[PDB]
Design a protein around this nucleic acid. Sequence first.
RNA 1: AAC
Lengths: 61, 60, 60, 63, 60, 60
Amino acid sequence: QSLQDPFLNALRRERVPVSIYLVNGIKLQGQIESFDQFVILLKNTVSQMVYKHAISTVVPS
Amino acid sequence: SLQDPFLNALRRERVPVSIYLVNGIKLQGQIESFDQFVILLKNTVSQMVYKHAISTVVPS
Amino acid sequence: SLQDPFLNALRRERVPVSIYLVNGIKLQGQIESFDQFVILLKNTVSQMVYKHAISTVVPS
Amino acid sequence: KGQSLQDPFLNALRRERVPVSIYLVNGIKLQGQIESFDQFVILLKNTVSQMVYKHAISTVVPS
Amino acid sequence: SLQDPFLNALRRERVPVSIYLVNGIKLQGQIESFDQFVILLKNTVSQMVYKHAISTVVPS
Amino acid sequence: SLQDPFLNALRRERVPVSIYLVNGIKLQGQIESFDQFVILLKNTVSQMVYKHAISTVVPS
RNA sequence: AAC
């Protein structure tokens, strides 16, 4: 986690808009509210739990 | 841990949820219960949903 | 484990169940048996279905 | 419970040389006989032996 | 472990890489860094790619 | 156990192989090395292939 | 939701 956690934490603390690309090709957008070992809590109009196993890539918007 | 308190608040307050599967299909219902690998999603009857097949869970 | 009760119930009742796979395939039959990683589904054939390929199990 | 079902099911097919179909999650159907398997792979023989990863397999069924 | 040397070699020599994903998508850039589960890919932006989503890593 | 002897015989004997990915793509070359998680495949270029993305390995 |  020596790279993943710092990467997600900096986006979380700064409240950067991010794009989360899922394996099926769908792109989600919002702010990272928090995360744990298996999930990311992504907030836009509502708070959704995204399973990391479904994510291909995370990048600031 | 963020997963379990998130699913518990939906379970206890019997909140209606959308579960999106990795193929894009949206399922809807109430979280009857969950464990390490599955979620039981009730409408009239419960179906068993494998977490490995879920991309997102969001209220309503 | 919620899987065992959920699946043992179906297995004993021999009721029809739909198994939806992660690729969108819908299988229809009876739950004949299961273990940690597979489910044996019975219709005109008995086929061994890997749980990793399953999204949902839905009583008919 | 563990491998109670999987391992006898595959062992029966192997022992009796039953022609099998293995459906991959991508939809592709493989056919042949199961010559052996371990924790992660199944060896399938048609004209030649190919190693199939269980992680890619959805269903196994007699042809 | 073959991953570390392979990926580090590509990091040290600044090699432009293609990261193919399991779903057909190609990402292109340089390996900025990596850990057990992710690879950081730098092109115009720095993106974090989950290894579970990657099929292959190759020079462009 | 079956996997390691299978792959080692292809590596040691430098046998041309075909590696099919879960999206159906066929890669070709020789296996230089492999570990728990990856296979290094040599053709014109050396590429790393994640085992989780492979469906089938067969001599070509 | 590809009986």
